[PDB]
Design an enzyme around this catalytic site. Structure first.
Site, PDB file in Angstrom:
ATOM      1  N   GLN A 145       0.817  -1.211   0.000  1.00 56.69           N
ATOM      2  CA  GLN A 145       0.000   0.000   0.000  1.00 56.69           C
ATOM      3  C   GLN A 145       0.850   1.260   0.000  1.00 56.69           C
ATOM      4  OE1 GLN A 145      -3.146   0.131  -0.386  1.00 56.69           O
ATOM      5  NE2 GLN A 145      -3.777   2.202   0.203  1.00 56.69           N
TER       6      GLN A 145
ATOM      7  N   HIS B 120      -2.975   5.249 -12.383  1.00 52.87           N
ATOM      8  CA  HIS B 120      -3.454   4.000 -11.800  1.00 52.87           C
ATOM      9  C   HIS B 120      -4.938   3.792 -12.104  1.00 52.87           C
ATOM     10  CE1 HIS B 120      -4.212   6.694  -8.207  1.00 52.87           C
ATOM     11  NE2 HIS B 120      -5.381   6.093  -8.333  1.00 52.87           N
TER      12      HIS B 120
ATOM     13  N   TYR C 217      -8.292   4.027   3.533  1.00 54.78           N
ATOM     14  CA  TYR C 217      -6.849   4.170   3.748  1.00 54.78           C
ATOM     15  C   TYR C 217      -6.481   4.984   4.999  1.00 54.78           C
ATOM     16  CZ  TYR C 217      -5.877   8.746   1.447  1.00 54.78           C
ATOM     17  OH  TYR C 217      -5.805  10.084   1.133  1.00 54.78           O
TER      18      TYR C 217
ATOM     19  N   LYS D 115     -23.599  21.145  10.084  1.00 55.50           N
ATOM     20  CA  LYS D 115     -22.687  21.203  11.227  1.00 55.50           C
ATOM     21  C   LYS D 115     -21.545  20.189  11.149  1.00 55.50           C
ATOM     22  CE  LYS D 115     -25.092  18.196  14.441  1.00 55.50           C
ATOM     23  NZ  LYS D 115     -25.587  17.251  13.399  1.00 55.50           N
TER      24      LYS D 115
ATOM     25  N   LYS E  70      21.992  10.747   1.725  1.00 56.49           N
ATOM     26  CA  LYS E  70      21.889  11.528   2.951  1.00 56.49           C
ATOM     27  C   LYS E  70      20.953  12.718   2.792  1.00 56.49           C
ATOM     28  CE  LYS E  70      23.488  10.525   6.024  1.00 56.49           C
ATOM     29  NZ  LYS E  70      22.964   9.573   7.052  1.00 56.49           N
TER      30      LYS E  70
ATOM     31  N   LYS F 284     -31.256  20.865   9.265  1.00 56.50           N
ATOM     32  CA  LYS F 284     -32.321  20.059   9.853  1.00 56.50           C
ATOM     33  C   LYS F 284     -33.704  20.674   9.620  1.00 56.50           C
ATOM     34  CE  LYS F 284     -32.789  19.907  14.245  1.00 56.50           C
ATOM     35  NZ  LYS F 284     -32.727  19.870  15.741  1.00 56.50           N
TER      36      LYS F 284
HETATM   37  C1  TTP Z   1     -17.631  13.097  16.562  1.00 58.21           C
HETATM   38  C2  TTP Z   1     -18.837  13.839  17.072  1.00 58.21           C
HETATM   39  C3  TTP Z   1     -19.774  13.190  17.890  1.00 58.21           C
HETATM   40  N1  TTP Z   1     -20.833  13.899  18.342  1.00 58.21           N
HETATM   41  C4  TTP Z   1     -21.886  13.163  19.154  1.00 58.21           C
HETATM   42  C5  TTP Z   1     -22.352  13.733  20.361  1.00 58.21           C
HETATM   43  C6  TTP Z   1     -23.768  13.349  20.435  1.00 58.21           C
HETATM   44  O1  TTP Z   1     -23.955  12.297  21.351  1.00 58.21           O
HETATM   45  C7  TTP Z   1     -24.144  12.909  19.151  1.00 58.21           C
HETATM   46  C8  TTP Z   1     -25.151  13.867  18.620  1.00 58.21           C
HETATM   47  O2  TTP Z   1     -24.676  15.212  18.549  1.00 58.21           O
HETATM   48  P1  TTP Z   1     -25.177  16.209  17.489  1.00 58.21           P
HETATM   49  O3  TTP Z   1     -24.840  15.668  16.135  1.00 58.21           O
HETATM   50  O4  TTP Z   1     -24.451  17.514  17.712  1.00 58.21           O
HETATM   51  O5  TTP Z   1     -26.745  16.352  17.590  1.00 58.21           O
HETATM   52  P2  TTP Z   1     -27.496  17.692  18.113  1.00 58.21           P
HETATM   53  O6  TTP Z   1     -28.754  17.298  18.817  1.00 58.21           O
HETATM   54  O7  TTP Z   1     -26.627  18.437  19.108  1.00 58.21           O
HETATM   55  O8  TTP Z   1     -27.800  18.652  16.868  1.00 58.21           O
HETATM   56  P3  TTP Z   1     -29.110  18.649  16.040  1.00 58.21           P
HETATM   57  O9  TTP Z   1     -30.307  18.434  16.902  1.00 58.21           O
HETATM   58  O10 TTP Z   1     -29.201  20.019  15.383  1.00 58.21           O
HETATM   59  O11 TTP Z   1     -29.081  17.596  14.958  1.00 58.21           O
HETATM   60  O12 TTP Z   1     -23.013  13.003  18.333  1.00 58.21           O
HETATM   61  C9  TTP Z   1     -20.998  15.193  17.999  1.00 58.21           C
HETATM   62  O13 TTP Z   1     -21.956  15.820  18.400  1.00 58.21           O
HETATM   63  N2  TTP Z   1     -20.103  15.821  17.221  1.00 58.21           N
HETATM   64  C10 TTP Z   1     -19.018  15.183  16.737  1.00 58.21           C
HETATM   65  O14 TTP Z   1     -18.135  15.827  15.916  1.00 58.21           O
HETATM   66 MG    MG Z   2     -30.835  17.484  18.522  1.00 58.13          MG
END
Ligand code: TTP
Ligand code: MG
Ligand code: TTP
Ligand code: TTP
Ligand code: TTP
Ligand code: MG
Ligand code: MG
Ligand code: MG
Ligand code: MG
Ligand code: MG
Ligand code: MG
Ligand code: MG
Lengths: 481, 481, 481, 481
Positions: free
Chosen positions: B37, B121, B197, B236, B337, B405
């Protein structure tokens, strides 16, 4: 000149003393990059791509860890930097003797091609280490870092293969006895090589590993047993010790002895046997060698790796066709068909010199089933597998010494009865796998009938799918119902 | 014939539909077990032993997961079983084209050996897939499982390389446009190949992944954009998208463009170049090909893997000596080097056409210092590396569609200064690494003088170790203090 | 007394010298078992159940690791066992001062309930440590293990909070300056506390940590910088260092500053405020204290943990009704509704004293829409988040000293131009989060109109969902479209 | 209202159906945040901070996974979304009945405080579930999503506690029998609750779990067994099944039954017993309850969590002195001292009704050694642990149905001798721990002599440290050496 750092997925950042680096950067050692740890296992577990090289680094690392911890906790052991370096070198080098696809080579190929020779990967490691030293000018470098080559090379070799023939070792005196229990433990089999392969094989196969080696290291001392200094474990850890071997067994059950992995090793072995007259490996001074004869010239063995598999696979020589063809079947996944597994019952064991006659027994069985096809002994493969705790029939924990919190210098023994009633009552058993080289539906059906009948005749254990694959055979055996 | 389960350390238990199994169990696919890889990276990170095979399996799996998730969330998409299977095949087969040591082959070796072609590739993957299908009677199997060979094979190829020659795709109409965003995403580089990857390379290298692909899959919808149905991420998640590319960059910084790994890729490429006239690979009709010409015949290319390295290493013929010796110097770790690293300032680019001239430039520098030796252009290597977010100078997030949303079906855009002020202000830059083929102390010192002086002359960035390796020189540049 | 071994999921088996054990087994230390590391984040990330206690153990462990590494590579630094112990103690005890729900207490509650006091968790740690020492007869134990209580205790306190006010430290002279860089690094923020919460928080959150502190430790030396022995990183590590802060930022972006977690901390703080007059915590001499006043008597603060949340919640006192009903609303998941996020532009910096004036502004905006529901100040919540690299507007890497492998004792500087041009240009920014306590549909619509028009008026950044939640407002602000 | 996504460190992103969310967002459910999964284990394993809440989410998620997988592989089972929701709710809610410190409450406290009642966490979960449904208007929400509350609530309760007392279930008919095998398996104990706690407890303890639940799920089918449709495992998974139970046993030996963890649970229990007269919990209609009576009013039980610990710890009431002091001695780590462990030999089994007679027996022993102090009954604690495979003396694998590759619809049985001879011969044993409440060296010596002598009198196993703690006693028992 200076030390190096190597980032390993298992151990993290490993520090290599410049002498170790000098040893590693040789053709003899770098060779291990081209030999898979689990051989044909990779053809069943796609994550198991790891080679003997990285494993070797891990083993050297752990050997260093253990010896350092011992020295640090008990300065009265007089463990020197020389001891540490020699132990690390032994750890690094005890895998040098492995051939193509590792255990396929010394477990299947060599015994068939050179049945007169009593070859081991350990001896291979000693010879290859000697060849590394002599071919790469290592001795002056060892003297440069405070080592005494006669003594210390003796010591390293002995750590790898045991006494080169009353204290039987010449590399180190009796007061350093414990040092021989680190890299390759001949007493009970608890060594760092196992720990590294548990962790690494697990990381690559996709199996979680139950054993905590770090914990073990933190609970290890040296105590006097039978007027000898040995590595002892804290009493508390006895359970964990049993589990260690359980883990080993589990790993052999899930991965190492996977029936398809094994049959693939078998097919590669057959290909090697059929290529052995036509493959040339240039050894010392132009003198040519074979796959089966590379093991008696280290310059040739150095060039004997997994590469052979590809050479055969890529060849155009008509004389290699057969061998080539076998490999090609592996590529098309037209493998010998697994027919089943069974075990001896009660006390009876199966002797090695009987193995050869087993496929004839299966082919001679008389299942009362209508069959158009008729199979012969050469159509059957019978793979006998000895599963044990590393000391044949013995319980290795009976060969471990323990210490109590209140008297950390007083060595004690702990019996199986003192731990649990849920522990194994036996420490060795045999699994018998049967395969058929004929792969069509009808041939596999017939093979199943023959196999189950054979199990019934020998009063072996009822195959798990017995009632399904041989419904006309199984209710003949009252013991099975 | 049934589904097979494969245990992968990254993804766990992966189900393979019997058609996928049929495709995988061909020499054309199995070939990928013998191509690393990360290539030369294995010689710096000993954990990186993984091959293109297991990675391909991973990609197919993730492609399946994404298309299934989209299908289950939005039944209105009319995603069919056929679609799913084709996307899975596209994911499985988009690495078929890689050569020995992967990117060493299409990135270094081919542009040098045959500078008059435009080899990728991707094209290699299309040709190889065509060859696999034709050589293995896969089409009748495809129709056995409800695929339409002509248009589905077109669709697969197109997923791999893009439009073969206005809606430009012939494999699927625009209302299935989203399907083309899964395996190889030409729009913004957000595809499953990357995800695999990231996880796998991190798992083997021993550095940790930060991108959460499962989360992304959760928050992925199909929304309408510019006449097209396209994959959109929830708003978000935008931070996490920037981070995704940030991870890629990080991975290139720590591992993929490791100075030593790169110089090893370089030495190997050179060895292959010096071996090219003498290594014969037998292709279709028994016709002989070379390493550089195997890409013209898929039957020969099928047999073109990392094995070449060993074939050069184990050779004895004088005509291969210069190649062989190079590889041997890799085994003794006598590497070119590393002299140092610099960057151009301003918006000052270095086009490819100038690369070959750079070694001469360094040697044409005038360090106002004593020099025991004079170096020529052929003593220097100038390796220039383009680090970017995958769309040259562009911000790939500017080409991502989002959804809120409050209105799930409505695609929107998010600009960079709408998210954070801490993000990169640029999205592309160049690294310049300089090595010296002469290794002796004096030549290395001289090389450092030449180099730093060359940095000063071209107003490149001050080498981090500038004041240490050339203290008689850096004072001249007052911008460096 | 002997040392103890503790198994931690992050660090594995960590050893604890009996002095550390004596310090740990006190009510003041065990207190931290009852305070969540991430406060209300647990109500968003169900894995984040971890408490300040285990984190403290980790910090002590890592402090010990770093100091031991430094000492074992450079014996010329004369690091004593005393130094090691004191560093470990500082590591263990620098979280003693935290209050209920950690940063909710010193970051929200205290500043609102007691605007006149300057309270930090650091000073709290100092007072709590002193209280621990005096309440538990630790001084003679310190003496028993070779510590000199006065200067060593001063040293520990200085490591925690800084100079207790030319060389400003009484605990240790300038030639041990680097010792003050391990536990709480005032110079650049790179300390072991960060490393533990990186690894630990990631472990519990289900987010992955990509910073490798072990690597950093292996590559750390002590060099002379303007006549002061200081901790210096290897040059090569510079990228990783940048990434270390990026990671911090990411962890704040994903979890620590999660909108719902923060609004939950807000509701809890609000409830604590509304309960402050009525809850009694008994302190020294039976004297009664409030929640807001418990910080004045260490005997009372010892009993101030997350338990408060449950006292209020479980209460029946009518006087507590108002507080209680809020916590219950958290239990029913009837939280204040998130309206959106925006950022200042150009040069604007929302100063702290202006925070209160923020709900007024939003409620004032004239969005010119159909508006069946009008809202006011106390319907809005505006939270200002300061995201930075731990040194305000400054680049912390400019306050880091490096070394090169050619001259390990020679410290140097590295500028951001010497590293990458994909790096951030600013190292601080502000986030404005707006919520509405009116949770019904019409109220939410209104609040969105108000908020967006407010962002337009203040020349703030256009909210990401802007063109969806305020369709008739976003096309006006011409710098947005 | 819509589906929510939750990020869990064990399972990643879990989808929760809005109905499930409505059930979760209740004080009866949120209560589980304040009850630790492993109770006193937290005071030995600092990583074990996790609570019943996150575990409950895990169990619901896994129940959903298994039911969905079964439904996808086998359409002819007619598994409806209603079934899926009921199984998810059962998995989600089957930990509702757990009290303070989990198994300390139902395993130690309640039996000692309420010996006249039969109490289980299962009954508690059913009661608390009914309370949850009735207090938060869940029935109309159930109906809103296509559930039929009368039969479905019965179904859920049945999944939790079993038949409410010929097909004895009312919730679902025999052709849906397999549904009852998911959340709580009365038949062989193989359910998703185990899988979750294996993974989670291991993740937090810093122990490594080798059970692959995903693999099990992929190889699970529903086959006809005795006029029922039951879950069948693929034949060759049998090894893994044995290992699953082995894992459970291991987890009990290392962590759940850690001698110090057990003694801490014992001290906490004792504290509650001494606080029960005085602590008040306000339940329905303002009525007051004790800790021991809270189980008789669900409204009060809703407020019974780990909080009481702290309440007792923080109290000023002199009536609570004796309780409080005990908890204080827990903080100072002045715990009852561990004397040792032994096991019954032969067939002998100890019944609960004999427990209280055990401390009397140890003190009534007569070790023929000079003692300085006389110990009595009140100074001894005897803890009896039952270690089995979940079905008393039985092998649970004798209650597993299997299926073979060639006839996937035909269920078969697999016996122990068909698998391995290295498997346990027994499936149940007893461990007897003895502690001493007086902690002075003298009383400890005495206690050791008493304990070993007692072990000898009853022909129990020889304590592992026997030859060390009592050199004058072990040579008397011929059965030991
Ligand atoms: C990796 C990661 C996990 N999480 C986790 C935490 C929560 O338990 C779960 C949901 O979080 P959110 O995705 O932030 O859901 P929310 O209710 O805050 O927003 P919304 O109602 O507008 O959809 O995801 C994040 O929120 N953000 C991240 O970047
Ligand atoms: Mg929510
Ligand atoms: C995490 C990480 C690991 N590694 C690994 C790869 C190597 O196995 C190991 C050593 O690599 P390097 O630290 O880069 O050592 P080097 O020999 O290339 O450079 P130098 O001689 O000047 O000191 O560290 C990195 O190189 N960089 C990283 O950021
Ligand atoms: C955890 C685990 C994984 N694996 C992996 C390895 C394989 O990649 C994958 C496939 O399962 P296998 O047992 O290898 O399936 P099989 O093809 O050998 O047998 P059969 O034809 O009768 O179905 O599972 C095991 O084999 N055993 C295990 O205990
Ligand atoms: C893996 C593992 C961890 N642990 C952890 C839990 C503890 O945090 C840490 C120490 O526990 P123990 O090793 O059991 O030490 P102890 O204090 O209970 O007994 P003693 O005083 O006689 O030495 O080890 C085990 O106890 N057993 C295990 O098998
Ligand atoms: Mg180097
Ligand atoms: Mg061995
Ligand atoms: Mg010869
Ligand atoms: Mg199979
Ligand atoms: Mg791509
Ligand atoms: Mg800080
Ligand atoms: Mg159960």
């Amino acid at each position: 000149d200076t030390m190096k750092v190597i980032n390993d997925p298992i151990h993290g950042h490993i520090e290599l003393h410049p002498l170790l680096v000098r040893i590693i950067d040789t053709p003899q050692f770098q060779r291990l990059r081209y030999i898979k740890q689990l051989g044909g296992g990779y053809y069943v577990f796609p994550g198991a791509s790891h080679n003997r090289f990285e494993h070797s680094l891990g083993v050297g690392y752990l050997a260093g860890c253990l010896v350092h911890a011992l020295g640090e906790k008990q300065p009265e052991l007089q463990i020197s930097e020389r001891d540490v370096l020699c132990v690390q070198i032994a750890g690094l080098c005890r895998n040098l003797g492995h051939g193509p696809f590792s255990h396929m080579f010394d477990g299947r190929f060599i015994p068939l091609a050179r049945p007169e020779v009593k070859w081991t990967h350990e001896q291979g490691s000693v010879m290859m280490f000697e060849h590394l030293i002599n071919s790469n000018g290592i001795k002056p470098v060892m003297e440069q870092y405070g080592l005494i080559p006669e003594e210390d090379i003796c010591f390293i070799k002995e750590q790898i293969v045991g006494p080169l023939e009353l204290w039987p070792y010449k590399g180190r005196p009796e007061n350093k006895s414990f040092l021989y229990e680190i890299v390759s433990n001949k007493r009970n089999g608890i060594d760092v090589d196992k720990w590294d392969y548990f962790a690494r094989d697990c990381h690559h196969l996709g199996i979680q590993n139950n054993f905590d080696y770090k914990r073990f290291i933190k609970f290890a001392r040296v105590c006097e047993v039978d007027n000898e200094l040995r590595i002892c474990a804290r009493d508390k850890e006895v359970g964990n010790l049993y589990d260690m071997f359980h883990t080993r067994n589990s790993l052999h059950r899930r991965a190492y002895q996977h029936k398809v992995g094994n049959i693939i090793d078998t097919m590669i072995t057959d290909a090697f046997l059929k290529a052995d007259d036509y493959i040339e490996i240039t050894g010392a001074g132009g003198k040519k060698y074979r796959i089966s004869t590379a093991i008696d010239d280290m310059e040739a063995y150095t060039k004997l790796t997994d590469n052979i598999f590809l050479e055969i696979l890529y060849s155009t020589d008509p004389k290699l066709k057969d061998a080539r063809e076998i490999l090609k079947q592996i590529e098309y996944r037209n493998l010998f068909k697994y027919v089943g597994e069974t075990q001896p019952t009660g006390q009876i064991k199966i002797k090695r010199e009987d193995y050869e006659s087993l496929p004839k027994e299966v082919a001679s069985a008389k299942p009362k089933v209508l069959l158009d096809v008729k199979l012969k002994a050469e159509d059957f493969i019978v793979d006998v597998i000895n599963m044990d705790y590393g000391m044949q029939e013995k319980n290795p924990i009976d060969h471990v010494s323990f210490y109590c919190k209140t008297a950390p210098n007083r060595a004690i023994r702990i019996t199986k009865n003192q731990v649990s009633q849920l522990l194994p009552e036996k420490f060795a058993e045999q699994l018998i796998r049967v395969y058929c080289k004929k792969v069509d539906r009808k041939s596999l059906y017939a093979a199943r009938q023959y196999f189950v009948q054979w199990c019934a005749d020998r009063n072996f254990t009822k195959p798990q799918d017995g009632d399904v694959i041989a419904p006309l055979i199984t209710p003949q055996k009252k013991e099975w119902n």
